[PDB]
UniProtKB/Swiss-Prot annotation:
It is found in: Secreted; Cytoplasmic granule. GO terms for molecular function: endopeptidase activity; peptide binding; serine-type endopeptidase activity; serine-type peptidase activity. The active site is at residues 45, 89, 182. It comes from Homo sapiens (Human). Mast cells in lung, heart, skin and placenta. Expressed in both normal skin and in urticaria pigmentosa lesions. It catalyses: Preferential cleavage: Phe-|-Xaa > Tyr-|-Xaa > Trp-|-Xaa > Leu-|-Xaa. Residues 1-224 form the Peptidase S1 domain. Its main location: secreted. Its EC number is 3.4.21.39. Glycans are attached at residues 59, 82. This is Chymase. It is an enzyme of class 3 (hydrolase). It holds the Pfam family Trypsin.
Length: 226
């Protein structure tokens, strides 16, 4: 998160920290959020050989009683996910066991309404990602408020599409989601409407988020069968 503030500890108890293994390099990290006691929603580009999820964290370098370090048994990547265009960048992780409910850990379910969210309003995003181009991932959970932009503002991303994706962050400001914030939720008035997907290496906003409304049938289909 660039240009944001430190979150009040444990104020977003659905937030998930992901550590992803691949066979030929060191660990990488993403965000995510718990929508059922045994399911986390994140981005498909965060997939790997194996993944561990930490719930209940604020400072990720200091172990505490609120932590729940949970095993993932299966990864469900969207079947049409495209590694070139990055269309359909969404994934569900099934946890081996259900998480415990505490003050620091709980689910964020969707409302029944599935309406399209137009440009103009302010929303909020959170994560442990880098706080600058030459800076490291934050030790504490950070957050920032950003504007939903007209789709023309993301035209330069040649594979962007308005009906699949949100365009997030005023280009006149530095505020933005960045590397390490992948898979985290964008909340508009307390409802999750987007998922951090990608942007520019130099951090100039806006960035591109998956539009959740469009994938609601697929999400329901996975959860019902599992
Ligand atoms: C297990 C594999 O995991 C990885 O390979 N990971 C986690 C690296 C990775 C990241 C990241 O570091 O978070 N982002 C987001 C991203 C990248 C670049 C610029 C951005 C500006 C704004 C927001 C987000 C931006 C990706 C997008 C597509 C992609 F294929 C890979 C990545
Ligand atoms: Zn604590």
């Amino acid at each position: 998160i660039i240009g944001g503030t430190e979150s009040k500890p444990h104020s977003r108890p659905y937030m998930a920290y992901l550590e992803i293994v691949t066979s030929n390099g060191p660990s990488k990290f993403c965000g995510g959020f718990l929508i059922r006691r045994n399911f986390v929603l994140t981005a498909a580009h965060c997939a790997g050989r194996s993944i561990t999820v930490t719930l209940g964290a604020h400072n990720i370098t200091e172990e505490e009683d609120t932590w729940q370090k949970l095993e993932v048994i299966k990864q469900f990547r969207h079947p049409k996910y495209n590694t070139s265009t990055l269309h359909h960048d969404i994934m569900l992780l099934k946890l081996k066991e259900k998480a415990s409910l505490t003050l620091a850990v709980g689910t964020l379910p969707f409302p029944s309404q599935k309406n399209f969210v137009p440009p103009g309003r302010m929303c909020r995003v959170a994560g442990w990602g880098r706080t600058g181009v030459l800076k490291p991932g934050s030790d504490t959970l950070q957050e920032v408020k950003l504007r939903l932009m007209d789709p023309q503002a993301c035209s330069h991303f040649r594979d962007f599409d308005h009906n699949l994706q949100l365009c997030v962050g005023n280009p006149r400001k530095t505020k933005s989601a960045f590397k390490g914030d992948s898979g985290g939720p964008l909340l508009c008035a307390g409802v999750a409407q987007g998922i951090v997907s990608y942007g520019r290496s130099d951090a100039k906003p806006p960035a591109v988020f998956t539009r959740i409304s469009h994938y609601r049938p697929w999400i329901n289909q996975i959860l019902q069968a599992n």
